[PDB]
């Protein structure tokens, strides 16, 4: 159970 | 349309 950033393919 | 890397806050 942990929260971090982390990229991602995300379209828009 | 674009989709690209993006950091974001994520739980696991």
Same mark, same amino acid.
């Given at each position: *159970? !942990? #929260?971090?950033? $982390?990229? !991602? *393919? $995300? #379209? *828009?």
């Amino acid at each position: *159970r !942990i #929260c971090q950033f $982390v990229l !991602i *393919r $995300v #379209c *828009r």
